[model samples]
Target: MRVLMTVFANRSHLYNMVPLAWALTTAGHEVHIASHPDNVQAISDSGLTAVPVGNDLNIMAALTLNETRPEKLTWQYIHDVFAQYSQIYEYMADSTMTADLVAHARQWQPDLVIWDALTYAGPIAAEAVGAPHVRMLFGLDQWGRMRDHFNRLTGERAADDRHDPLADWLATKGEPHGVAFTESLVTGTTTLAVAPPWMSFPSEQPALSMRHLPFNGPAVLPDWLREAPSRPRVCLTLGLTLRELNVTLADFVNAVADIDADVVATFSAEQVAEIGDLPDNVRAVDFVPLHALLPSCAAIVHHGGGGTRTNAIRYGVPQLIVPNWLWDEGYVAERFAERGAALVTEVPDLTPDRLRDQLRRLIAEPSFKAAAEQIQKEYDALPSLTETVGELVRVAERGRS
Candidate 1:
């Protein structure tokens, strides 16, 4: 089977899709990854076929290109991102990225299309060719918020009068002039949430089929991790797209500096540069192969990106989620807090003392590990991601029949 995969142009979204793509290819299916042209090397590096759909366009830089300093994601800053960046919706969805995909499908037809929920354009092109599309959502559906946010951007009489005016404004691009860009893909058979059943809204849209796959990654258990150290181990990160994520890495460092623990942080080069003067014990690295080190971690302090959260669970280490207001980081963190496996903090309130104390309690507390172990046991029992995609292949093949 030939599988055409679509993901947003960000590293975090693509990270989640890598496991699924690898699984399909390993199972003897031909895999083609369709993302921004800038990501061509990323696709190639993963050993998958790179199908360029559109130019990356430096979307992030374009949005904040002129600003000298990173602005707090306040109401004013979010407005600027939408006013400028929202135009990319059409550029991204309206045959800009998928034009190559449309032409390619004509010659090398695919049996099914796998798409990132955010990248609905590929699914639209897939339908144009009568191909079955399997929609894959990377993290927090935020579907309701997505619609509400985007609709308001049109300047139409606000469809849903709600409090999250910021997200509504961000999710809705202006007027959606050319086509119902979002509706085209929303109509397909979708698969979403790399998390388990316990983490989602109880009353979710019953229309889509969701599979919670193991947080698969280039993960391994390093020999050093197996040795129990005298001090507790804490790992910190602001996620890959740190600019989009509102959490400040410096605050996280300050928060836990006073604690008696071994501090190791995995961050991108840019994020590390943002770190304020660090303490003697706190260490930050541009990147560390997490699959090898997570099993030894005592706690994870992060922005609650799905990939990071999934790895933490794989190792049975509880998490501390400090969310920027936009995405579902806060909600995901709350879910873990409820489960006793994690704690939640908002970005604005994430002071050094507050964070340090959270880490002290989280690492020292036995119940946190117990909670993570409980979730870990649940993860151990689930069907492998290999089987999940195999089932999807059958879904696509059966749909063809």
Candidate 2:
């Protein structure tokens, strides 16, 4: 069977789908990844065939233009922000990608369609071609939660009184072809759920539980990581998503260096230049694959990226998250804290002293590791990519039939 995967122009979003994509490919299915022109190279780099469609989406520019810096964020303010995202960013993306994606899907005639959760184009195209599509999540189901909240607050109103911006936009995209929008396009036929059961939101959507496979591009283990540490080793990383933020690594380095443990911190070249010399106990490098580095560490401090958070959990490392509340980062952190595997600090409270105290707890406290190991066991129980192939084939055959 031929499998076609689609996402918007984000590489991090695409990375989450790689392991499964490869699993399908390795199982002798023909796989083609479809995305914007900007993401073609990234898709190809993952060793999958790339089918470039649509113009490069300017999501960053859209987000920057709609910047809202409220002194205090209320629940209504947060809802409004997501509403704006649905109105502007999501609408623009679906508009930009729909025609090309529909054309490609018609031409490729894929047996199954899998897409990033935010990329509504995938389902539109899938529906256009009468193929079932799966919405794969990169993190917690924040989009689903927000959409449900929006509906609960607005669904009971009169049809003419309701302002269903997302549905309206989806309708506009679908109407050009013979398709009318449905709620299933916003969701999907099935969901490729990656988060562990404890960290996931309640969802009645049909889902396939998949493990988070670490993919940091091609990586070679450093010689130093092979050797065990003399004292407790701590890892500090502000993942790719957090790298562009105004986080100062110097403060974290200073705090962790004072602790009686070794620290391994990853930074970009520009960040390294800005931060200058590191302390004796802190080792700085441009990048090291988290899969390779986290195993040697006693604790991890990072931004609440899905990959980083899941990878830490996969390795059974206690975490301290300085989460940015852009999407589900803060929520994921809170869930981890609830699970007793992590310590979390939101933006204003993210301080060196606080991080130091948390790191100390992460190292000294036995409960965190114990809780993390329990979650790790849950992760281990999920079917491996190889083990899950037959089920995927069954879904595809059922969809095609």
Task: Work out how many backbone clashes candidate 1 has.
Answer: 8
TM-score of 2: 0.89
Query: What is each predicted model's overall lDDT from 0 to 1?
Result: 0.65, 0.78
TM for every model, in the order presented, reads 0.76, 0.89
Pull out the clashing pairs in model 1: 53-97, 149-168, 149-172, 150-172, 219-291, 220-291, 255-352, 255-356
Extract clashing residue pairs from model 2: none
lDDT of 1 by residue, 312-356 (tens): 877889888886544566677888999999877777675667777
User: To one decimal, what is the Cα RMSD in angstroms of model 2 from the true structure?
Assistant: 3.8
Error of 2 at 395 (Å): 2.5
